[PDB]
Scaffold this motif. Structure first.
Motif, short mmCIF file in Angstrom:
data_model
loop_
_atom_site.label_atom_id
_atom_site.label_comp_id
_atom_site.label_asym_id
_atom_site.label_seq_id
_atom_site.Cartn_x
_atom_site.Cartn_y
_atom_site.Cartn_z
N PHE A 1 -3.85 -5.31 -0.41
CA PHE A 1 -2.82 -4.39 0.04
C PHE A 1 -2.30 -4.77 1.41
O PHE A 1 -3.07 -5.08 2.32
CB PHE A 1 -3.36 -2.97 0.06
CG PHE A 1 -3.31 -2.29 -1.27
CD1 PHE A 1 -2.33 -2.62 -2.19
CD2 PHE A 1 -4.26 -1.37 -1.64
CE1 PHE A 1 -2.27 -2.01 -3.42
CE2 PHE A 1 -4.22 -0.77 -2.88
CZ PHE A 1 -3.22 -1.09 -3.76
N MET B 1 -5.38 4.27 -7.75
CA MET B 1 -5.04 2.95 -7.23
C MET B 1 -5.92 2.58 -6.03
O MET B 1 -6.31 1.41 -5.89
CB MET B 1 -3.53 2.98 -6.99
CG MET B 1 -2.76 1.88 -6.31
SD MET B 1 -2.20 2.55 -4.74
CE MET B 1 -0.87 1.43 -4.31
N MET B 2 -6.30 3.57 -5.23
CA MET B 2 -7.39 3.42 -4.26
C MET B 2 -8.72 3.14 -4.95
O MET B 2 -9.52 2.33 -4.46
CB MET B 2 -7.48 4.69 -3.42
CG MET B 2 -6.32 4.85 -2.47
SD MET B 2 -6.02 6.53 -1.90
CE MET B 2 -7.33 6.72 -0.72
N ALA C 1 -8.78 -0.28 -5.72
CA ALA C 1 -9.18 -1.03 -4.53
C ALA C 1 -10.63 -0.81 -4.14
O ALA C 1 -11.17 -1.63 -3.38
CB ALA C 1 -8.28 -0.66 -3.35
N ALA D 1 -1.90 7.21 -6.75
CA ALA D 1 -2.40 6.46 -5.60
C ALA D 1 -3.89 6.66 -5.40
O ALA D 1 -4.55 5.75 -4.91
CB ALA D 1 -1.65 6.86 -4.33
N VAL D 2 -4.45 7.80 -5.81
CA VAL D 2 -5.90 8.00 -5.73
C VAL D 2 -6.63 7.03 -6.66
O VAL D 2 -7.63 6.40 -6.27
CB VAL D 2 -6.25 9.46 -6.03
CG1 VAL D 2 -7.74 9.65 -6.15
CG2 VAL D 2 -5.71 10.36 -4.94
N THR E 1 0.83 -1.21 0.00
CA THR E 1 0.00 0.00 0.00
C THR E 1 0.87 1.26 0.00
O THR E 1 0.78 2.15 0.85
CB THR E 1 -0.98 -0.04 1.17
OG1 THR E 1 -1.72 1.18 1.24
CG2 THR E 1 -0.30 -0.34 2.51
N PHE E 2 1.70 1.35 -1.03
CA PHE E 2 2.77 2.33 -1.14
C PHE E 2 2.44 3.29 -2.28
O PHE E 2 2.83 3.09 -3.43
CB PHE E 2 4.10 1.61 -1.35
CG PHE E 2 5.28 2.52 -1.42
CD1 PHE E 2 5.78 3.11 -0.27
CD2 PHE E 2 5.90 2.78 -2.63
CE1 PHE E 2 6.87 3.95 -0.33
CE2 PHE E 2 6.99 3.62 -2.69
CZ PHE E 2 7.48 4.19 -1.54
N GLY E 3 1.68 4.33 -1.96
CA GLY E 3 1.41 5.38 -2.91
C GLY E 3 2.41 6.50 -2.82
O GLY E 3 3.15 6.62 -1.85
N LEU E 4 2.45 7.33 -3.86
CA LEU E 4 3.36 8.46 -3.88
C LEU E 4 2.64 9.76 -4.22
O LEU E 4 2.95 10.81 -3.65
CB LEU E 4 4.48 8.22 -4.89
CG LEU E 4 5.40 7.01 -4.69
CD1 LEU E 4 6.37 6.87 -5.84
CD2 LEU E 4 6.14 7.12 -3.39
N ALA E 5 1.66 9.70 -5.12
CA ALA E 5 1.13 10.91 -5.75
C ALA E 5 -0.28 10.60 -6.28
O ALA E 5 -0.98 9.76 -5.70
CB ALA E 5 2.11 11.41 -6.82
C1 LIG Z 1 -5.76 0.29 1.90
C2 LIG Z 1 -6.69 0.44 0.96
C3 LIG Z 1 -7.79 -0.51 0.80
C4 LIG Z 1 -6.65 1.61 0.02
C5 LIG Z 1 -6.34 2.96 0.70
C6 LIG Z 1 -4.93 3.22 0.25
C7 LIG Z 1 -4.60 2.33 -0.74
C8 LIG Z 1 -3.38 2.34 -1.39
C9 LIG Z 1 -2.44 3.29 -1.00
C10 LIG Z 1 -2.73 4.20 0.02
C11 LIG Z 1 -3.99 4.16 0.62
O1 LIG Z 1 -4.36 5.05 1.59
C12 LIG Z 1 -3.32 5.67 2.37
C13 LIG Z 1 -3.96 6.80 3.14
O2 LIG Z 1 -4.54 7.75 2.24
C14 LIG Z 1 -3.72 8.18 1.22
C15 LIG Z 1 -4.12 9.34 0.58
C16 LIG Z 1 -3.33 9.87 -0.42
O3 LIG Z 1 -3.63 10.98 -1.15
C17 LIG Z 1 -4.87 11.63 -0.88
C18 LIG Z 1 -2.13 9.23 -0.77
O4 LIG Z 1 -1.39 9.85 -1.73
C19 LIG Z 1 -0.11 9.30 -2.05
C20 LIG Z 1 -1.75 8.07 -0.13
C21 LIG Z 1 -2.55 7.51 0.87
C22 LIG Z 1 -2.17 6.18 1.50
C23 LIG Z 1 -1.71 5.18 0.45
O5 LIG Z 1 -0.57 5.16 0.02
O6 LIG Z 1 -5.58 1.39 -0.96
#
Ligand SMILES: C=C(C)[C@H]1Cc2c(ccc3c2O[C@@H]2COc4cc(OC)c(OC)cc4[C@@H]2C3=O)O1
Ligand SMILES: CCCCCCCCCCCCCCCCCC(=O)OC[C@H](COP(=O)([O-])OCC[N+](C)(C)C)OC(=O)CCCCCCCCCCCCCCCCC
Ligand SMILES: CCCCCCCCCCCCCCCCCC(=O)OC[C@H](COP(=O)([O-])OCC[N+](C)(C)C)OC(=O)CCCCCCCCCCCCCCCCC
Ligand SMILES: CCCCCCCCCCCCCCCCCC(=O)OC[C@H](COP(=O)(O)OCCN)OC(=O)CCCCCCCCCCCCCCCCC
Ligand SMILES: CCCCCCCCCCCCCC(=O)SCCNC(=O)CCNC(=O)[C@@H](O)C(C)(C)COP(=O)(O)O
Ligand code: SF4
Lengths: 82, 156, 110, 98, 114
Positions: free
Chosen positions: B53, B36-37, B40, B33-34, B26-30
């Motif tokens: 994740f 990619m959420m 999910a 990642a939105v 669960t490694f977002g950068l920018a």
């Molecule tokens: C865990 C699940 C089911 C979802 C939620 C989630 C991911 C994947 C990655 C991340 C994440 O949430 C966390 C917290 O919120 C943000 C918000 C962000 O931007 C608004 C952001 O930008 C890089 C990164 C993040 C985290 C991040 O890496 O999948």
């Protein structure tokens, strides 16, 4: 640290461990800048080696005025008893 | 022959296990990642493909570089990648992770995460959609599906 | 005897799956890697409070060890004495908790 | 007499000689003390059961409870020593030589 | 030509602050080699500190060497505190960079840059 002659020999031993100095031209009254031909930073790390062996801090204002081993052993002797 | 049919079926078995149990970090950068959420999120829903994740990179299987890689974080990304057990995979999501993107000529951006980590799938977009990222994950599953590890182990 | 067979079988299955987990993927050669944390290298500072909640657990566990023969002790013919001492032991566990309370022992892990 | 009593007494004396010969750690001294307690627990239980002496069945519970409170007291002393010196090494505890 | 100073009135106090910064770096090199577990030695790191101090050995302006002391203390505090990684310390040792052609003839051979 007990006797003055041991302090002088330990000053000269810290200087002869310091590998930049030619040990032949090293004396008690040898000058770092013009006789030994050393840079200023070389004198600064000599002072820090003196602190590494003698174990007491020297301020910067009265370490700049130490341009020979005789001045170094006089400064050590002034900050101790002997 | 017999042993080659054995290692072919074992390759199909272990490649099936690896492609159908992908664990991304669960490694977002920018901005990627939105989306990619959103991959999910319930509509596209990576979890129905066996794709969950995980927070620690030790129990992870694929590193999705979702976002812009800067010079200040490139050793952090490489160290996170080095903390992963093998076989691990890299999916490059979006233009800045792919080649540098909108910030390509910048002083502080790594011009593609493939300068740092070995990228297996390059998912293009700005950001690529959750459908497009899931397409990249399915293409990664097809790539793991045609790996020939025990066939080459038998034939080396 | 049946207990020992069951313990040996469960321990054997545990050790067998750990052997399969530490030697079947260790048949891989994969690659000679190096792998070169919130605290970096400094020493872990002691926490007085985690130790105090562990000691509070140990003392209440001893008070539990006193309380454990109560379902057998309800069968006795000296029931007034048994009820008195049972209420007194649970009362002493409560008074130990109250002194842990009021002297600030249950704080920041309350 | 009985053969197992030799083994339990020898375990008590081995934990004794471990306590009576420090190496470095104070936690190891506490562990040797509680090994002494453990052997005492086992030996009391074997005696009291072999006697069919019913009223002393509550005695090993009392031994365990009192000496576990004793062990908690010793752990707190060790924790204060290791808060003073950073380690629980016994060579730090020699300021009372003079 | 009357300007406002930063910390130092003249070059003597400036050299004093430079000298104390060099004392701090000289003391900090062995701890830096240990807690970053570098593959360099202590004498080699101290020679790099000497090279970086002697790179700016010609400035006779108090304000410029005050800012050099300030930037050296920022490097110093980012080294003492574990903020740099291994890479940010090893960037002073340009190890992956191949040694460039030095004289006229080899730079003539390899390209157009003077
Ligand atoms: C865990 C699940 C089911 C979802 C939620 C989630 C991911 C994947 C990655 C991340 C994440 O949430 C966390 C917290 O919120 C943000 C918000 C962000 O931007 C608004 C952001 O930008 C890089 C990164 C993040 C985290 C991040 O890496 O999948
Ligand atoms: C408890 C029930 C479930 C049990 C687990 C699931 C059942 C299947 C278990 C066996 C799976 C295959 C072996 C482990 C995975 C190996 C993957 C791999 O890439 O192997 C390559 C490895 C090594 O191959 P390699 O030499 O190509 O490795 C790469 C090395 N370089 C980088 C230099 C090229 O193969 C092996 O170690 C062979 C293991 C045995 C193969 C099968 C024999 C029969 C086993 C029964
Ligand atoms: C505070 C304590 C409150 C409870 C006191 C004991 C209550 C009780 O049942 O006592 C009778 C019990 C037992 O008497 P009993 O009434 O159960 O007698 C029946 C006889 N037996 C048990 C043999 C079948 O104790 C005594 O008579 C004497 C022991 C207690 C003496 C006082 C203890 C506290 C001293 C503090 C200093
Ligand atoms: C006579 C009385 C003892 C009878 C048994 C003797 C067994 C052999 C022991 C010989 C001595 C070994 C030794 O070095 O003991 C000292 C050691 C503490 O020293 P340490 O700090 O480890 O090392 C620095 C050196 N003083 O101390 C220890 O390591 C203590 C270990 C004690 C464990 C005893 C186990 C049972 C021994 C047999 C029954 C008694
Ligand atoms: C691991 C490696 C990390 C390396 C990092 C090194 C830190 C870099 C900080 C550098 C800060 C400076 O350059 S301050 C120097 C500027 N000083 C001057 O321009 C004045 C001239 N200074 C000198 O000549 C110095 O040698 C002295 C010692 C002050 C005086 O000598 P001169 O007299 O004979
Ligand atoms: S490729 Fe574009 S949209 Fe995607 S994270 Fe980078 S800047 Fe944001």
């Amino acid at each position: 640290p007990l006797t003055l002659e041991g302090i002088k020999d330990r000053v000269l031993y810290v200087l002869k461990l310091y590998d930049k100095i030619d040990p032949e031209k090293l004396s008690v009254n040898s000058h770092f800048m013009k006789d030994l031909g050393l840079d200023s930073l070389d004198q600064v790390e000599i002072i820090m080696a003196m602190e590494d062996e003698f174990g007491f801090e020297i301020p910067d204002i009265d370490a700049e005025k130490l341009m020979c081993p005789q001045e170094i052993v006089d400064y050590i002797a002034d900050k101790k008893d002997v | 022959s017999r042993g080659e049919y054995v290692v072919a079926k074992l390759d199909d078995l272990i490649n099936w296990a690896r492609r159908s149990s992908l664990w991304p970090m669960t490694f977002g950068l920018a901005c990627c990642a939105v989306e990619m959420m959103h991959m999910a999120a319930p509509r596209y829903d990576m979890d129905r493909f066996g794709v969950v994740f995980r927070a620690s990179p030790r129990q992870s299987d694929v590193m999705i570089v979702a976002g812009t890689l800067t010079n200040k974080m490139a050793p952090a990304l490489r160290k996170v990648y080095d903390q992963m057990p093998e076989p691990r995979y890299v999916v490059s999501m979006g233009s800045c992770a792919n080649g540098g993107g909108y910030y390509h000529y910048s002083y502080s951006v790594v011009r593609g995460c493939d300068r740092i980590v070995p990228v297996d799938i390059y998912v293009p977009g700005c950001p690529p959609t959750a459908e497009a990222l899931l397409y990249g994950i399915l293409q990664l599953q097809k790539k793991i599906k045609r790996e020939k590890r025990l066939r080459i182990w038998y034939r080396r | 005897m049946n207990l020992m067979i069951t313990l040996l079988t469960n321990f054997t299955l545990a050790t067998l799956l750990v052997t399969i987990a530490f030697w079947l993927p260790q048949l891989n050669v994969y690659s000679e890697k190096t792998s070169p944390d919130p605290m970096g290298s400094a020493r872990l500072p002691f926490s007085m409070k985690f130790f105090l909640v562990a000691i509070t657990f140990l003392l209440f566990d001893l008070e539990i060890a006193l309380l454990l023969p109560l379902p057998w002790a309800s069968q006795t013919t000296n029931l007034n004495t048994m009820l008195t001492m049972a209420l007194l032991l649970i009362f002493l566990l409560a008074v130990s908790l109250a002194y842990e309370w009021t002297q600030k022992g249950l704080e920041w892990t309350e | 007499m009985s053969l197992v009593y030799m083994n339990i007494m020898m375990a008590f004396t081995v934990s004794l000689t471990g306590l009576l010969m420090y190496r470095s750690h104070l936690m190891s001294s506490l562990l040797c003390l509680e090994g002494m307690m453990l052997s005492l627990f086992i030996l009391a239980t074997l005696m009291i059961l072999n006697s069919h002496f019913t009223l002393a069945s509550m005695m090993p519970i009392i031994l365990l409870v009192f000496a576990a409170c004793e062990a908690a007291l010793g752990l707190s002393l060790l924790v204060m020593v290791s808060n003073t010196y950073g380690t629980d090494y016994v060579q730090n505890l020699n300021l009372l030589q003079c | 030509t009357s300007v406002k100073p930063i910390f130092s009135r003249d070059m003597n106090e400036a050299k004093r602050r430079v000298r104390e910064l060099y004392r701090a770096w000289y003391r900090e090199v062995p701890n830096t080699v240990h807690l970053f577990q570098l593959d360099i030695s202590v004498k080699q790191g101290r020679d790099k500190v000497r090279e970086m101090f002697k790179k700016n050995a010609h400035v006779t302006d108090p304000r410029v060497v005050d800012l050099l002391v300030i930037k050296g203390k920022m490097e110093l505090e980012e080294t003492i505190n574990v903020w740099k990684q291994r890479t940010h310390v090893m960037r002073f040792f340009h190890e992956t960079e191949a040694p460039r052609p030095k004289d006229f003839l080899s730079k003539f051979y390899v390209g157009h840059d003077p």
